[PDB]
Amino acid sequence: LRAITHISPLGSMDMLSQLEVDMLKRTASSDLYQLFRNCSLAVLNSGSLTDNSKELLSRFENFDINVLRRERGVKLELINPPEEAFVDGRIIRALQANLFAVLRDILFVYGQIHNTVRFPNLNLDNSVHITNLVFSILRNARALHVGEAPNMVVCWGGHSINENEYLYARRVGNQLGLRELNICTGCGPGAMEAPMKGAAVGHAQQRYKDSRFIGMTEPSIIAAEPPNPLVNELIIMPDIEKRLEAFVRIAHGIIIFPGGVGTAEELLYLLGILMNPANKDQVLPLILTGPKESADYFRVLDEFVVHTLGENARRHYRIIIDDAAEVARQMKKSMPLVKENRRDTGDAYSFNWSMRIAPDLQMPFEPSHENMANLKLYPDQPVEVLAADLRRAFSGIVAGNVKEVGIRAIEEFGPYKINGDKEIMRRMDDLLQGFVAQHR
Ligand SMILES: Nc1nc2c(ncn2[C@@H]2O[C@H](COP(=O)(O)OP(=O)(O)OP(=O)(O)O)[C@@H](OP(=O)(O)OP(=O)(O)O)[C@H]2O)c(=O)[nH]1
Numbered sequence: 001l002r003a004i005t006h007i008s009p010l011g012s013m014d015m016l017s018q019l020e021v022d023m024l025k026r027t028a029s030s031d032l033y034q035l036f037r038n039c040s041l042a043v044l045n046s047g048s049l050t051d052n053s054k055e056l057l058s059r060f061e062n063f064d065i066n067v068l069r070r071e072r073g074v075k076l077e078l079i080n081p082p083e084e085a086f087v088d089g090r091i092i093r094a095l096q097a098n099l100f101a102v103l104r105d106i107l108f109v110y111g112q113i114h115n116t117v118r119f120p121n122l123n124l125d126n127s128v129h130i131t132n133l134v135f136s137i138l139r140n141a142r143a144l145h146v147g148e149a150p151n152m153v154v155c156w157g158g159h160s161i162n163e164n165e166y167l168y169a170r171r172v173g174n175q176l177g178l179r180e181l182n183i184c185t186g187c188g189p190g191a192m193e194a195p196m197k198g199a200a201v202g203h204a205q206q207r208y209k210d211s212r213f214i215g216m217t218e219p220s221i222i223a224a225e226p227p228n229p230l231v232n233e234l235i236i237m238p239d240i241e242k243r244l245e246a247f248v249r250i251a252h253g254i255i256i257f258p259g260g261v262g263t264a265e266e267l268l269y270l271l272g273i274l275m276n277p278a279n280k281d282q283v284l285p286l287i288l289t290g291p292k293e294s295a296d297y298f299r300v301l302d303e304f305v306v307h308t309l310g311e312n313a314r315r316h317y318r319i320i321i322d323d324a325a326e327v328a329r330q331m332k333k334s335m336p337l338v339k340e341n342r343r344d345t346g347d348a349y350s351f352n353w354s355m356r357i358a359p360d361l362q363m364p365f366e367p368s369h370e371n372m373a374n375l376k377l378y379p380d381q382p383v384e385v386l387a388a389d390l391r392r393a394f395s396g397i398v399a400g401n402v403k404e405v406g407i408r409a410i411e412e413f414g415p416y417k418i419n420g421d422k423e424i425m426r427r428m429d430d431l432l433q434g435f436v437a438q439h440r
Contacts, residue, residue, distance in 0.1 A: 002062075002079055002080060003080060004078070004079060005077075005081070005086075005089075005091075006076070007075060007076040007077075007078065007096060007099060008075055009074065009075070009100050010097050010100060011096075011100060011101070011142075012097070012100050012103075012104045012141070013073070013104050014100075015073070016073040020108075021070075021074050023118075024067055024074060024103070024108065027111040027112070028066065028107060030111070032110070035106060036065070036102070036103075037063070038057070038223040038224075039102045039106055039223050039236070040076075040099060040102050041057065041060060041063055041065075042057070042222050042223060042224070042225065042227070043098040043099050043101075043102055043227065044081055044095060044099070045085075045226040046094070046095060046098065046226045046228065046229045046231075047084065047229040048084050048226070053224050053225050054224060056226075060080070060081075062080030063078075063079065063081055063082075064079045064080070065077065065079065067103070074103070076099060076103065094229065098231070098234045102222075102234075102236065104140065105137070105141070105235065105237070106236060108140075109140065110236070110238050113133075125363075127362055130242065130362050131245065131249075131357070131362075134237070134242050134246050134249065135249075137242075137246075138235070138250065141235050143235060143250070144348075144350045144351055147349065148349060148350060149339055149349065150252035150335050150338045150339050150342070150349050151180065151181050151252065151335060152181075152182050152183075152184055152212070152214075152250055152251055152252050152253075153181050153183055153253045153254070153255060154183075154184045154185070154247050154250070154251035154255070155169075155183055155192070155195045155254075155256075155257070156186070156247075156254070156256050156259065157185075157190060157191015157192060157194075157195075157256070157258070157259050158190050158263075159190045159192075159259075160189065160190050161191055161257075161258070164291050165257065165290065165293075165294070166190070166191075166194050167291070168257075168289075168290060168322070168324065169191050169194035169195050169198070169257055170195070170197055171198060171324040172198065172255065172289065172324040172327050172328060173202070174198035174199065174202045174324070175202065175328030175329075176199050176202065176327075176328045176331065177198060177200065177202020177205070177206070178206055179202070179328055179331075180203075180206055181199070181328070181331060182199070182212040182213070183196050183199050183213055184212075184215075184216060184250065184251065185214075185216070186215070186217060186221075187215025187217040187222065187227045187234065187235075188217070188221070188227065188228060189228055191257045191259065192215075192228065195255075196213045196228065196230035197230055199211065200213075200230065211232065212232070212233060213230050213231050213233065214250075215227050215231035215234050215235065216235045216237065216243055216247060217236055217237075218237050218239065219238070240364070241361070241362050244269060245357060245361075245362060248284075248352065248355060248357065249351050249352045249353070249355065250350065250352075251284070252284075252334070252338045253284070253286070253334055253335075253338070254270065254285070255289060255331070256286070256287070256288045256289075257289065257290055258298075260435065260440045261394065261398065261435055262398070264304075264431065265391050265394045265395050265398065267288070267301070267305070267317075268387045268388075268390045269391050270286060270316075270317075271305070271317075271384075271387045272361060272387040272388040272391065273356070273357055273384075274286070275309065275312070275313065275316065275384045276356055276384040277384075279355060281341075282341070282354070283337050283338050283340075283341035284338075284352075284355070285330065285331055285334040285337075286316060286317040286318070287319075287320055287327055287330055288318070289319070289321065289323075289327045290321060290322070291322050292321060294321065295321050295322075296434075297434075298321065300430075300431060302314075303430075304427055304428075304431045307427050308379070308386070308390070308424060308427055309383050309386065310383065312383070318330070358384070360388055365392045365395070365396075367396040367399060367400050367406060369416050371392075371396075372392075372393070372418040373419070375419075376389050377393065377418065377419070377420025377421060377425065378420060378421040378424065379424065393418070396416075397415070397416075397417075
């Protein structure tokens, strides 16, 4: 009635103390179990060709996982796991490494972090501690290499995309791989998987040995979305805001693909950091690119930025339509400039400390009628503030029409549409009307 198998640690959690093991033990038996189980299950389905995520999560009712204590360290016990994850009775290494990546970031980091009874005085409300914590997580994930030239390109894109956009992202990935650049994404399908599949080919063509494909996700996502099978360095941050800060501090360049309206929220976030005068001398290339069909999509998005943040916004990004070689060539040229930029201030090559991220951008935000109310949506205040309050505005009603939390108050309380300048509020509907005219 039950088939069992023991997995030894690989890639992480391979050198533990007995106290740490005992800590992991109770954590695996506290309320965190449901989260820990659903994440392990998602990892074990990376590569299973059932596109419907939640469909497959139910197919495995038998599955359960427990943590085994051994004098030396820990082992993972799997009860009735998916068959497609094994080869002649042995677990596929890639999955095995992701399997213990969950053990690390969910139980060791996530479960012991909220515990302030367990960890030292860690003021989660202090902006500095957050940044250093993000660093500690990445270091614990063995994702920060010493004295390595900048070659990491973060990529953001839509969850599900048409076959047309997918090919362009693959092509861009290939051109990035052909130039010995590595890739970091949201660890999912769609635009978060295509650039990796393409970069793998280029690396092979260039005989590039150690590809780094970093999937950076969070518990609520990975619990329902298995990671794409290209990810070879999995990382799960505790909060949404900590995941986004991780993206910014490890990246040496950022490429944004069409992601529907979410692209706007993602774009405003970056501008809120770059257009901060404290970051005037920072060097972080930003390219927004897409197939020939996404011409007007980015046009609409560009007019919005100009008409609200000013032409000054364009000195921080470049739009490239249907040219993969140019996108990759731009990023390759910027790497020495990043290296030179970090070297000019003494910053680390693998992690951007000096980049000032305002504390408002590191804290969670809830789309209630109160928080939204005091959104300063006029152009009189600093540009970097307007962009911050604009991000918190989009995602506010993003999940506010059909999301289980938005319509619980959108038809019981109605739309809020917080006070702002009559001109700015229209340039948005022009943006929303524009995305609708293209079936986004
Ligand atoms: N900013 C930075 N430097 C790093 C990093 N990892 C290694 N380094 C190296 O540390 C060295 C810099 O130390 P120093 O030689 O004393 O130069 P400093 O004037 O003191 O710079 P600083 O005061 O820190 O701002 C350089 O090596 P070399 O120049 O001697 O050789 P190579 O050219 O091959 O890289 C850097 O390449 C890193 O993550 N960030």
